[PDB]
Design a protein around this ligand. Structure first.
Ligand SMILES: Nc1ncnc2c1ncn2[C@@H]1O[C@H](COP(=O)(O)OP(=O)(O)O)[C@@H](O)[C@H]1O
Ligand SMILES: Nc1ncnc2c1ncn2[C@@H]1O[C@H](COP(=O)(O)OP(=O)(O)O)[C@@H](O)[C@H]1O
Ligand SMILES: [Mg+2]
Ligand SMILES: [Mg+2]
Ligand SMILES: [Mg+2]
Ligand SMILES: [Mg+2]
Lengths: 208, 525, 156, 75, 172, 212, 77, 72, 76
């Protein structure tokens, strides 16, 4: 299964019979060396290739296996975030700002509605209010006061107001460089709503 | 006396028997339990069940289909087994009506136990039910309307039938889009009935509205290492040859020489034979080559040298679908290139769906094969969407085969019940009571439909019965708000075949269950 | 109309309440692992394998939950990971809060079908609001990409 | 409510258990540090005898159950 | 007395914790029962967890035999020790019947047990070897008897020699 | 250690000696203090304990909670004993004594682990306690006027402070005035048996009354 | 007559019995009111409010409600 | 319990109570056609309501204050 | 949430409860069984019953009285 990756990286064309083994099917490289990692194993590195392919490799090191696995997961998360920037190139503030703005705007939308659907969308906004409360929690801040301050600042017109953990309060977070792609919040909202609807359209359980 | 209630016991240990009243009681309880379980998942406002498996894998399944619910349940009541088999056979015959036929059979058997309590011989009930079934079938056949001559009317009927089929399932959220998708997919078959030509691909992630019908075809296979990943005006050669260390089929053959040089010469001869086979394939003048079996490294390299895409391990379904969509002929010999038809499509490229890469065929020549990509938030959502789409496709294919259609929303049930009642109040004897019970069950079906929505079912059914007695033969249940409306105007239409099959299968199962007066069980293993 | 239809079964209400309780329990479980100040979890399976992770999808799939609603939430987190890559904890918390609200809505006497349509309307409005809030970004701007990567890595 | 087939520890309890395990691993070998330190004897279940002062050997030979103790041994 | 269609429904999924705990305990007893049943009836007619996970472990290519005893057992134990000294590659071991909790008939009439395991299956189930072997035969007799069936496998250092992958490189 | 066919003590005797047993004793004391840790202050919370017979005891009192705990650790029993002593001599502060003792032990644990002789720690504790008691006696505020109104106010304020941590803290002024009135009518000895306490099920706290 | 084992259930039973002893009527209203109060306290707790604060607010609101009941009360012969 | 929609009926009754000053407007459980309990002669003792509210508040306070269980 | 269908258990060992549909089903089944048992002994053409005691005495009683039949049965 590594043949495709190796051929893309170096440019070598695989040879299955000695008759077709010719010089034009070799992949020229600057250097190919086997390096020892301070007595903790040996790695072979092929660095520098004429006409390099569109592949990269990340070597992850750590004291113990658990932190290595967590570092791999975090690096994968970062790569997925950059991918989310690649497609649907839209950026929003983080820090719980989109959730509190959604809560406020959906409360207004509920006030514009009537009947039981108004109550339902008001409950939807109140449920969306949870994420800023959880963000204020786990950081030592008072959740109720912080959430109220977020809501007041967003009603005043500060769309980028969010929870700041460095200063232990509320401030503009675009100056704090806390941003995330749009197709994270949008995807989470859509998928969560679909799952909630699917669960709601359930009334019985049967054991096979 | 009786076998069980005798001074001498005639049975082995673990084997018993149930006489008339006891066997009838057990059968009726099983049937009513099955009907009550499968119901409440009926009509536009029906809910879904959760099938939690107790096995080691512990599979979780959320479904609205009655047949799937009845398949995956531990059933010990033999009458319940009969009803489950009826539902499975109904699902095999047509895509829809499983819940309808199961509930109709259960209601018929409930009326049967009521009549038995009224001291009526079961044979009288069977005769009355046969007469009522004949009358109801005749009325339903007379009520059918056909629109196969008019293209636009037939298309509108197809859309209405797809909407009616998808109304009950989870796809009702995006009913319009999903019905357009299903109708287009079925119409792309160009009259063929093989639903295997339509491939449903489930990809996790994305909204349910993100599901779409590809304009060409999608393949979930891979391409060789040194072969192009994109070709235009592709000429396709679909094959079923070995191309994997191809040995001569003389199983008694072996290489028996006295030197390793001869072994090397034989090996070079084998490689030359494979090269000659690849050259014969290339003589067809192709751009992409699809083989059903695997392709080893030497033929893959040979294809890569010629710049020919080589897709390997496309199973029987894969090669059949490619032949249907591109018009190529599946080949296994390459000595007569002029006698082999080559598939053609405008573009072949690799698309990125979710986190997986698939081979995309664009601008296909024939296109008599569809790929439907389903996107969802959970695996259960994807499975239920696939089942609902399968039901819609099955019903649409049946409608294409037989264009006769009948009105839904209980209208067909109401008219059949009216005909049964008209027959019932025309003859004497307890067969009249049996036919009245038959009509009562037929009317109970839309009553359960109205129950599922929380509407005033009694008032709605009374209004429908009055309208059908007056002469309004198109009145039904308007489920948008809970009134009676014109199904011709509202566009709530079903396939005549589905309703006829439901009626006949329910009557058949009720008749065969009612005939049983003794259940004898052997010693369990 | 007067009395109206009488709810004979009342078992579907119990099923809905059980599903909501399971989802809320799952959210409360993965509630403290969100944000730059969230902590990691240690999960020890039936074997001796040990995992220390903050990823919501990994936490959810590493522990057997035995409840259909919890399993569907795990599948939801997996789907979010497949599509986006991060935000796997946030979507599960959102679903749990939504079902929490659904409990109070159902207790008020609202059919669990008007709730679904209302939630669809709210989702559409929220998508519109989020799109309005968004800002265009170009791949040539290295600073925005670095900020996004740093924000993603901050919680780990 | 969780319905997870297993035991769960949260908050101060798990932190205290981890710290106790690490401190126990430390106290195992704290007596073999510096020139005034003294060696230890490790006896298997089959009677094999090992006498050593090296911390890594002692931690490798011992059986360790707690994950934090495993972390320290692998450290 | 009706409602035969109970349809327990939510019950099994709501009390699944106790059900799975009981299932795990029953399965844990089940491996022990399966292991002990391979000796009784199958050959008799014609801590336990330590034994279980010792049989489960180790390579399938090494012949491992176990002995069941109760307190001429001493002579056979001495012969087994001699064979262990003669066959270091083998992992001779013994375990009491009361620890396994075998049947009373095995305890009363099958005290000398020569159980041989090879890859998790019984390639030899020599039980009550008093008649066909004797009471005071030496280790060589047992070795010959066991090797006649092709079951047993076919210099000396000072004390020890064993101790990064850079072995030695003089390259400049 | 050898089997020694004839043994000194009875078989099964368990002995623990050295620094590790002292560290374990300190840890047990901390464990005991943690069980009543959250019951201190106006924001304190109650604890519920169920015995073998199924009876449930709900209490914010540290001494009661420690009594209902079935401690068997020899070093941990000292904290329960001093809580009982504080309850007997004073009646309030049962939660504070255990926390103070456990915090003393926690603070001196690092010095114990590094080989400090226990006698030095004991002498330091004695000196510090003597100095603290002298300071408390010196800086305590007393009024040498014997004015009835201000002395009554002092009693009421002390009662409210002692009551502002329980489930009756919402009505702490009412119950404090009741308690001061009840105590002032005791004659010379202030015997507790002279203050009857009758509990009647039903009714709000404000419905409770003091009978003259 | 209910055979409960949870301690809070026993507390609720004792509350109902206390209402019966003091008044004789409304033994069902107290249980429902307490359940609703605790259900709302659950969602207050989820938002990070100390339970003592919830109890103090409940006491203040109960005093207000009692005063309002006294205000809107009517006398009969 | 009377079959009416809870939220709609309660909201309508509360709105009527706010609009026209009448604390006697309740839930027409018996479907007598009127919401005024004074005409319907639905009468409750003030002591009963006060005891209900007080006892519920005290029990809720106790249940909230408990944060530890030590069952055997 | 139901009293018994909740993650927390509120009952002693062996205590049980049945909610609306289950309670109605059980009560109706019991009443219908009792009515079907006592009937067929009704009217001029009604038939009698045999009551066999499971105790040591094993008293035999043949009766047509409904109250007598209903008294000497162990109903759960
Ligand atoms: N939009 C609608 N309006 C009225 N009745 C409908 C509608 N959609 C479906 N039905 C009715 O619901 C019944 C059940 O259909 P469905 O649940 O989709 O499949 P099944 O027949 O397998 O139960 C059908 O008999 C049909 O008449
Ligand atoms: N520096 C920060 N300040 C405020 N909020 C932050 C910061 N970094 C991340 N967050 C927020 O923490 C939330 C959780 O992100 P993370 O834990 O990385 O993944 P997940 O969304 O899957 O939990 C994000 O929604 C983000 O808005
Ligand atoms: Mg259908
Ligand atoms: Mg993240
Ligand atoms: Mg105090
Ligand atoms: Mg009353």
């Amino acid at each position: 299964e590594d043949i495709e990756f190796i051929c893309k990286t170096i440019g070598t064309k695989p040879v299955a019979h000695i008759d077709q083994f010719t010089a034009d099917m070799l992949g020229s490289a600057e250097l190919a060396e086997e390096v020892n990692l301070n007595g903790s194993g040996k790695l072979l590195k092929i660095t520098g290739c004429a006409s390099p392919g569109k592949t990269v490799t990340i070597v992850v090191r750590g004291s113990n296996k658990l932190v290595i696995e967590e570092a791999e997961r975090s690096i994968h998360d970062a790569l997925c975030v950059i991918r989310c920037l690649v497609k649907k190139r839209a950026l929003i503030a983080g820090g719980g700002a989109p959730e509190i703005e959604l809560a406020l705007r959906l409360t207004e939308y509920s006030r514009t509605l009537s009947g039981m659907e108004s109550y339902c969308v008001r409950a939807f906004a109140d449920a969306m209010e949870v994420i800023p409360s959880t963000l204020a929690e786990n950081a030592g801040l008072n959740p109720i006061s912080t959430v109220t301050e977020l809501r007041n600042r967003h009603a005043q017109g500060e769309k980028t107001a969010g929870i700041n953990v460095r200063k232990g309060g509320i401030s503009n977070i675009l100056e704090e460089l806390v941003v995330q792609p749009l197709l994270v919040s949008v995807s989470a909202l859509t998928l969560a709503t679909e799952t909630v609807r699917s669960i709601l359209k359930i009334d019985d359980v049967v054991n096979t | 006396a009786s076998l069980s209630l005798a001074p001498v016991n005639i049975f082995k240990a673990g084997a018993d028997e149930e006489r008339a009243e006891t066997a009838r009681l057990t059968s009726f309880i099983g049937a009513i339990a099955i009907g009550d379980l499968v119901k409440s998942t009926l009509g536009p406002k029906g809910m879904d069940k959760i099938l939690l498996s107790s096995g080691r894998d512990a599979s979780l399944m959320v479904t609205n289909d009655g047949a799937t619910i009845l398949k995956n349940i531990g059933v010990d009541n033999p009458a319940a087994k009969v009803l489950v088999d009826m539902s499975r056979v109904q699902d095999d015959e047509v895509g829809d009506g499983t819940t309808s036929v199961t509930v109709l059979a259960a209601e018929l058997l409930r009326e049967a136990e009521s009549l038995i309590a009224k001291k009526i011989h079961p044979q009288t009930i069977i005769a009355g039910w046969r007469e009522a079934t004949k009358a109801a079938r005749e009325a339903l056949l007379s009520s059918a309307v056909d629109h196969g001559s008019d293209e636009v009317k037939f298309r509108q009927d197809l859309m209405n039938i797809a909407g009616t089929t998808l109304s009950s399932k989870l796809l009702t959220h995006h009913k319009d889009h999903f019905t357009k998708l299903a109708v287009e997919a079925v119409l792309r078959l160009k009259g063929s009935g093989n639903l295997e030509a339509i491939h449903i691909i489930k990809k996790l992630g994305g909204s349910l509205a993100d599901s779409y019908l590809d304009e060409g075809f999608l393949l979930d296979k891979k391409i060789g290492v040194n072969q192009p990943k994109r070709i235009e005006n592709a000429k396709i050669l679909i094959a079923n040859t070995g191309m994997d260390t191809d040995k001569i089929k003389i199983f008694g053959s072996r290489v028996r020489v006295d030197s390793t040089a001869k072994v090397a010469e034989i090996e070079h001869a084998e490689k030359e034979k494979m090269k000659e086979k690849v050259e014969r394939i290339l003589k067809h003048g192709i751009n992409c080559f699809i083989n059903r079996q695997l392709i080893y490294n030497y033929p893959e390299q040979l294809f890569g040298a010629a710049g020919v895409m080589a897709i390997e391990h496309a199973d029987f379904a894969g090669v059949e679908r490619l032949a249907l969509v591109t018009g190529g002929e599946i080949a296994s010999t390459f000595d007569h290139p002029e006698l082999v038809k080559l598939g053609s499509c405008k573009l072949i490229e690799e698309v990125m769906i979710g986190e997986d890469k698939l081979i995309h065929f664009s601008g296909v020549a024939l296109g008599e094969a569809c790929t439907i990509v389903l996107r969802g938030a959970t695996q259960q959502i994807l499975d239920e969407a696939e089942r609902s789409l399968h039901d819609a496709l099955c019903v649409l294919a049946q409608t294409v085969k037989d264009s006769r259609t009948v009105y839904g929303g209980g209208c067909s049930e109401m008219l059949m019940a009216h005909a049964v009642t008209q027959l019932a109040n025309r003859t004497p004897g307890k067969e009249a009571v049996a036919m009245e019970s038959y009509a009562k069950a037929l009317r109970m079906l839309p009553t359960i439909i109205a129950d599922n929505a929380g509407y005033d079912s009694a008032d709605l059914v009374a209004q429908l019965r009055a309208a059908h007695s007056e002469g309004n033969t198109t009145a039904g249940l308007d489920m948008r708000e809970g009134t009676i409306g014109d199904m011709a105007i509202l566009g709530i239409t079903e396939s005549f075949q589905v309703k006829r099959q439901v009626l006949l299968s329910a009557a058949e199962a009720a008749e065969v269950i009612l005939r049983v007066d003794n259940i004898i069980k052997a010693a369990p293993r | 109309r007067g009395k109206g239809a009488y709810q004979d079964r009342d078992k579907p209400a119990q099923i809905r309440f059980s599903n909501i309780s399971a989802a809320k329990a799952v959210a409360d479980a993965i509630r403290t692992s969100l944000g730059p100040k969230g902590m990691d979890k240690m999960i020890q399976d039936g074997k001796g394998d040990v995992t220390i992770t903050n990823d919501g999808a990994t936490i959810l799939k590493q522990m057997q939950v035995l409840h259909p609603a919890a399993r569907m939430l795990v599948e939801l987190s997996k789907a979010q990971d497949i599509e986006a890559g991060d935000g796997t904890t946030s979507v599960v918390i959102i679903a749990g809060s939504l079902l929490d609200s659904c409990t109070k809505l159902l207790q008020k006497g609202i059919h669990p079908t008007i709730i679904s349509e209302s939630f669809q309307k709210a989702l559409e409005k929220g998508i519109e609001i989020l799109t309005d809030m968004s800002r265009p970004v170009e791949l040539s701007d290295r600073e925005t990409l670095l900020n996004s990567a740093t924000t993603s890595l901050n919680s780990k | 409510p969780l319905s997870v087939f297993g035991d769960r520890s949260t908050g101060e309890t798990i932190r205290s258990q981890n710290v106790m395990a690490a401190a126990s691993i430390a106290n195992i070998v704290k007596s073999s540090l510096g020139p005034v330190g003294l060696d230890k004897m490790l006896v298997d279940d089959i009677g094999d005898v090992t006498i050593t002062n090296d911390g890594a050997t002692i931690l490798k030979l011992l059986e360790v159950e707690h994950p934090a103790a495993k972390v320290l041994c692998e450290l | 007395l009706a409602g035969e269609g109970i349809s327990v429904n939510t019950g099994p999924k709501g009390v699944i914790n106790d059900w799975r705990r009981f299932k795990q305990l029953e399965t844990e007893q089940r491996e022990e029962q399966c292991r002990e049943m391979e000796r009784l009836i199958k050959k008799l007619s014609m801590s336990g967890e330590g034994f279980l996970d010792m049989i489960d472990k180790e390579q399938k290519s090494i012949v491992i035999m176990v002995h069941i005893y109760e307190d001429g057992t001493e002579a056979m134990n001495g012969c087994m020790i001699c064979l262990a000294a003669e066959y270091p590659a083998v992992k001779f071991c013994k375990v009491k019947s009361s620890v396994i909790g075998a049947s009373s008939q095995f305890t009363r009439n099958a005290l000398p047990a020569l159980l041989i395991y090879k890859g998790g299956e019984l390639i030899g189930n020599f039980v009550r070897v008093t008649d066909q072997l004797g009471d005071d035969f030496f280790a060589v007799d047992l070795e010959a008897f066991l090797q006649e069936f092709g079951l047993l496998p076919e210099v000396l250092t000072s004390v020890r020699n064993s101790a990064s992958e850079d072995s030695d490189l003089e390259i400049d | 250690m050898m089997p020694t066919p004839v043994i000194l003590l009875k078989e099964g005797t368990d002995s623990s000696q050295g620094i590790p047993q002292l560290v374990s004793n300190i840890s047990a004391c901390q464990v005991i203090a943690e069980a009543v840790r959250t019951t201190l202050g106006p924001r304190g919370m109650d604890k519920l304990i169920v015995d073998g017979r199924g009876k449930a005891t709900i209490s914010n009192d540290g001494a009661t909670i420690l009594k209902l705990l079935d401690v068997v650790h020899p070093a941990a029993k000292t904290l329960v004993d001093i809580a009982k002593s504080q309850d007997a001599e004073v009646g309030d502060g049962t939660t504070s004594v255990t926390l103070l003792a456990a915090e003393f032990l926690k603070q001196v644990k690092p010095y114990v682990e590094e080989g400090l002789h226990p006698q030095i720690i004991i002498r330091a504790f004695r000196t510090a306690t003597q100095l603290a008691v002298n300071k408390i006696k010196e800086i305590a505020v007393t009024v040498k006027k014997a004015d009835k109104v201000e002395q009554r106010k002092l009693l009421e304020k002390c009662a409210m402070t002692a009551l502002s941590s329980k489930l009756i803290s919402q009505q702490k002024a009412f119950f404090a005035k009741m308690v001061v009135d009840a105590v002032m009518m005791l004659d010379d000895l202030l015997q507790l048996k002279m203050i009857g306490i009758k509990k009647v099920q039903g009714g709000a706290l404000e419905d409770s009354q003091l009978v003259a | 007559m209910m055979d409960v084992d949870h301690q809070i259930a026993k507390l609720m039973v004792e509350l109902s019995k206390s209402q019966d002893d003091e008044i004789g009527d409304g033994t069902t209203g107290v249980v429902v009111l307490a359940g609703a109060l605790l259900e709302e306290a659950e969602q207050l707790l989820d938002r990070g409010i100390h339970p003592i604060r919830i109890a103090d607010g409940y006491e203040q609101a109960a005093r207000v409600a009692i005063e309002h009941l006294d205000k809107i009360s009517d006398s009969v012969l | 319990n009377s079959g009416m929609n809870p939220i709609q009926t309660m909201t309508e009754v509360r709105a009527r109570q706010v609009k026209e000053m009448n604390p006697a407007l309740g839930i027409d459980c018996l479907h007598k056609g009127t919401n005024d309990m004074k005409q319907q002669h639905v009468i409750e003792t003030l002591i009963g309501k006060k005891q209900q509210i007080s006892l519920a508040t005290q029990m809720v306070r106790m249940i909230l204050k408990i944060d530890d269980i030590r069952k055997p």
